[model samples]
Target: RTVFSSLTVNGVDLGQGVAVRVPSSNAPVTDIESDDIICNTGFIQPVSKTVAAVPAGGTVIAHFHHTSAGYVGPDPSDPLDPTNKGPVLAYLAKVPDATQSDVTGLKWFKIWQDGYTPATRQWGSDKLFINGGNATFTIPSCLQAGQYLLRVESISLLNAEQYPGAQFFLSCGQINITGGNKVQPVGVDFPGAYTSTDPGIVTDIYEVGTYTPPGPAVFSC
Candidate 1:
C-alpha cells in the first residue's frame, strides 16, 4: 500500500501490540519515510465475501494508512524506553466489490499477505478509518515482504432507497521495507486482485464481483 526509502531503528518489546522507533534521514535518498504514504487519504476500508453472496448491487468501503510514519516516538501508556523497539508498521485491510450492502457494523477487516493467495477470508478487527471521500489507509507497523491487496463488500438495508448500491475501494500499490534504516528493497512484488485494474469511481454493472477499481492518478505528481 505504500513505499519507503530506507532506515533502521532499535527498541525493546513493550508488549501489548505496541512498539516505538525514531526516524533518521541518511544521505540524499528519496526519504520514503517522509513521503505521504496514505496516512489519511480517505480510502474506504475494503470488505468482501463472494460474488454470488451479494444480493444485487451492494456497497463496500476500504481504508488505508502509512504504517512507517506512525513509528515516531512513544505513547503515554508505553513511554519510550529509549532501548525498546517495536513493529515498524501495522495495518488492517478487507476485500472489495460485492452485490450487497456489506459495509455496516464492520468493526474490523484483513488484507492479503505479502505473497499468498487469499483463500480464506481474514478480518483484522482494528479500528481503521477512511473518511467519506478520500483514498488510502494507514498502518501501525512497517510491514513485511510479499504482495498485498484489499477486497471489500457491503450489506445494504431494506429501507435504503437512495444510493442503494454498496460502495467499496481498491488499494493498489507496492511497498518494500526492512527492520534496519538502509531502506533497501529486500523484496519487491505487486498485488493484482480486486477485479478492477486501474479505473476510478468504478461501477461496472455488467461485470461480476471482486473487481479492482482504477486509481485516480495525476501526472503532476
Candidate 2:
C-alpha cells in the first residue's frame, strides 16, 4: 500500500494531515464506481479545518510514499516501485466547503496531468518517481475563486491489459482560492468518468505504441 503523505505548498511543508486528507493506506481504487474513489477510503485523520489558502496559478506540491509511515529508513521503493509505469493526474472540484467528507455528486475537473510519451517511452509515474515522488503543478489561473478539493492521483498500469488491473492511488487536499478569472471548466463524475472499455484503462505499456491516459482531456487553464 502507498499513501500521499504530506503536502508542500509555496515551499512550505504543511506536515502530514495538515490540510490534506491523508488516507489510511496507499491502496489503489480499483473500482471507479466505489464512493471511496472520490478522495479515498479509511482516513487516518478527520477532515481538516485548515483550508490552505492558495492563490490561483500558485504552486501546489503533492508528496507520495510507499507506506503511511513514510521514508521508513531508506528503501528502493520509497515512492513507488520502478516498474509501476503509468499516468499521473490531478483534478479540482469546486465545493461549498473544502472540508466536506461526503463528495458524492460534486463535479470534478481535470487541472493537470501527465501521460506516457511515445518518443521517450516515459510514463507520468516515471517523472514523479524520478523527482523524489513529488508531483509539482500549479492551480489553474482561470478558475473561479472559492473553496475546492485538490485531488491528486497516480495510476499503476503494471497489469492494465486486464479490466480491473490498473491501481489508482489517490488523495485530496482542501484549498480556498483567492483570485481567479472565473473560467468554468467542464466537470466529470468519478464512476461515470472511467470504464473498463477506456483505451488506456486496459493496455500493455511494454508493447503499447501510443497511449492517452483514461480520463477527459486535461483542462490546462
Candidate 3:
C-alpha cells in the first residue's frame, strides 16, 4: 500500500498521492485484481502540475534497463536506485514443477496496459516503448500545439522476499520535446504499442523498456 507523498512535475509538487510503502509486504497484484481500480478516487485529486508541452515536430528517446538487484542501491553511487518513484515494474516468478525446473532463458512473452484512467487524468499504463528489435517512437503531427516535460520510469514484477524483488528505474534516452501532432510509433519489443491517443495526433509519449533475462543455474550449466 502507498503511504502518500507529494508528486513533483518539473521540480514542482503537483500535490500528494498515496506514496507506496517501501519494502512492501503485500502480494503482487494479479491478473484478476490489477485492474480493479477506482477512478477520480485516488483518495485525492492530483493537482495539475505545470507541465511544459511537447513542442510540435520534436522527438526524444526513453531507454530502460532492468536489474535483478531490487534497489538502485543504498549506496550513494548506485544509478538504478528507486529514489524517484514511478508506476512501471519488471516482475519475476518462480519456476514450477519438474519439467519447468530449468528456468533457463525463461522469457516473459510481453506486458500489456488496459487503458487510460477515465477520471484520474493520469497516463493509464506503461509498457515497453523501446527495445533491440524496434528503433524509436515518433511524435504525431495531429495534436493541439504545446510544450510538455516528458518523463519515464522503470519498475519490476517479482515481489517475493526470497527472490529478486520488483524495482523501478529512470529511463535513459533523451525525451524528445515535440510539438504539433503526428503518428508517433514506439518501437518496443512487444506485441502492442501504447500512446496518448489512438487516431488523433500523439504528442506525448511514455516509453517502457524490458528487463535483463536471468542467467542459468550452476548445476544445469
Candidate 4:
C-alpha cells in the first residue's frame, strides 16, 4: 500500500523522501502506524538530509510505485466504499532548518489533493492512474523563499474503523524555495494540522456528500 516511488521537481528525481533512509523503520505503514508519519525522526541521531531547489509556483510531482497489488481505487461494486481506497494529499510546510528537531515546529499549508470520483476509485482522475502515475502540486507563489518541507501522504481507509487502524503512508522532501514573494501565508503545525476525527481522515467517502480535506486552506501568493 506504499504510495511513493520517486519524488520529482520539474521532471527530475530528487531521490526518495527524507524518511526513506537507514535507521528509520521501513515497514509498511499498516504494520507501524505510529512510526510511519513524516515527522518520526528518532531521538538517537538525525537522518541525513538532501535539498532540492524549486522555483516558487513550479510543479512538484510525486510518482507512485506499487509494492503489492498495483493501482489504487475502491472496489468496482462499491464506488463510494471507503474499504481499500482513499485520498492522496500534498502539503507545504515551512521548517527552520535541516535538523531533525526542526520537524517539531513545522507549520503546514495544504497545497493540493486528488479529487474523488465514485465511478472510478482513482483519485485526481487518471493523473495518478496507477503504476508510475504521479500526483502533482504547485508551490505557492506567495511563500517567502527559504527552507521548507514538501510533505505527501496517502491514507488507506480499508481498516479505518478505528483511529489507530487507518494506514498513513508519508514522506517529506527538503527544498530550498527560490523566487517567491515576501508574503508569508497562514499555516498550521504538522502534527496539529490533522486529527483522527477530521471528516477527511475519518469517514467513508461514499457516505459523505461533499469532501473537505483536513488542515487549513491553500495559501496563494
Candidate 5:
C-alpha cells in the first residue's frame, strides 16, 4: 500500500478500517473534482465515522507510513534527489461534516507546515522521512471548541513543472477538539488558496532555487 494509507496521531493508531479511508489510488471515488478539499480531488476521501479525539493545543505526531515492507524513507543517494522530495503540511478547518463534498466553503487555516529550503540536504524538513516517518504539529489551543478536520497534505514536486504534473497525496482525520478557547481564527478556502503561479505549487525543487510553500503564514493561536 502507499504511504498515505495509515494514519497515527499521538502514538495511537486510528486503524486501517477506522474513519481514515485509504488513499484514492487504492479506492477511487466517483465524480472527482478539482476543487475538492482533499488532495488530487478524491485522494484520502473522508469516511462517515469519527476516529479519534485529541485535546486542543496538545502536541501530536501525525505519522504517515508505507504499506510496503521495510521501507523507512526515500533513498538519500537515489537519483530522485530533490525532485522527488516535497513537504508535508497540515491544516485545520471547521466543517459541517467530514464528507468529501462537505469541505466546501469552509475556511481552512494553516496550523502547521514544513517546506523546501536549499539549506537542508533534503531541501525540505517537513517530509515524512525527515521526522522519523511522520509529521508532528501542535493543535492550536485558542480554537473555538468544536469538531474539525485535521487535513494532512504532501506535495510531490518530482514532476511539478506542469500543473497536471504536480502529485498531491492527502488525508483527513476527524477530530473533536476539547479545552479550546473561543478565539476563532481567520482562514482561506481551498482550491482558491493555491494558484498555478504560486512559488511552492509550481517550481523545480531540484534546481538551486528558492521555494515558499503554498498557503498563508501559520496562524497564531
Candidate 6:
C-alpha cells in the first residue's frame, strides 16, 4: 500500500515514481477497474518533470520502504510485512511524453514478473523483502528510442482471499530508452490488464499453493 518509495536505474537514482507527501499518504490500489490503478493514483505532481535516460535493455530497480521518506532503520516492515506475499511485476508503456501528467490511454506491455515459487513455497513479495526491497529487472532492448513510463508494482495478498482486498503498491518512473531495434510489442490496457476476481488477486498465502499472475505474458526482446 504505502510501501514503494522510489526507483533506480542501474545505480542512478531516478526519483520521480513515488508519491508526494500530503496530509496523509495514499491508500493501496484496490479497485482494479479504476483509472488510478494505471500507475496507482496520487503521483502527478511530484512525478519527475524531467525524463531520465536509460540504456535500452538495462537494469531498472524498484526500491521499497516502510514509509515514503525511505529506509528508517531495522524494522520488521522495512519494505513490507514478511507475512504479506504476492507477485512483483514490471511494465513499459510508450507515451508521447513520459514526463506528462496525463497517463490515461497509455498502452502498456508486461516486461518482467516474479510470481510464486512452488519449490520453496515463496511468493514474489517474499523475494522483494529478502532482497531488501530491491526488485530489479532488465529493460527490453527491442524497444524504439523514445520516452516511456516504467511501472513497477507488487500485490500484497495479506488481506486478500476476498474480492477487492488485494493491495496493489505501484509507481511509475519517466525514462528515455535509447538504442534498440524499435520493434512494436503488443500492449494491454491497465484497467483491462487485471480483474478483481483474479486468483492471485484473491488468494490466501497461508495455503501456499500455485499462484498465477493476473496479466499478460512477459514480453521479451
- Listed in order, each prediction's TM-score against the native is 0.19, 0.95, 0.26, 0.74, 0.79, 0.91
Which tens-of-lDDT digit does each residue in 73-174 have in candidate 3? Answer: 333312222332224322112112212212232222111211234244332122232121111233334433433222232333223122223322321111
Of the two candidates 1 and 6, the one with more favorable TM-score, higher being better, is: 6
Question: What would the per-residue lDDT of candidate 5 be over residues 1-221, giving only the tens digit for each residue?
Answer: 13344455567866653545445452221111355435334444344476457778877655455431223456552211234567677888886655444666778888988775566645443355545556778888888877777777666676777665556656666677778889778888776777777767777656636677888889986
Ranking by TM-score: 2, 6, 5, 4, 3, 1
RMSD of each predicted structure: 19.4, 1.3, 18.3, 5.7, 4.5, 2.5
Question: Against the unseen true structure, what C-alpha lDDT does each candidate score?
Answer: 0.21, 0.84, 0.24, 0.59, 0.61, 0.77
Q: What is the Cα-based TM-score of model 3?
A: 0.26
lDDT value, candidate 3, whole model: 0.24
- In candidate 4, list every pair of residues with a backbone clash: 142-221
lDDT string for model 1 (1-221, tens) is 22121111222212211111111211111111222121212222242221221111111222222222333433321111111111112222222422233332211223221111124211121112112111223322333322222222111111112232222212222122222122112221112221222222233323323422222111110
User: In model 6, how many backbone clashes occur?
Assistant: 0
Number of the predicted model whose lDDT against the real structure is largest: 2
Q: Pick the candidate with the highest TM-score.
A: 2
Lowest-sum lDDT 10-residue window in model 2:
1-10
Question: How would the candidate models be sorted by lDDT, starting from the highest?
Answer: 2, 6, 5, 4, 3, 1
Comparison by lDDT, 1 against 2, better one: 2
Cα deviation at 100, candidate 2, in Å, is: 1.0
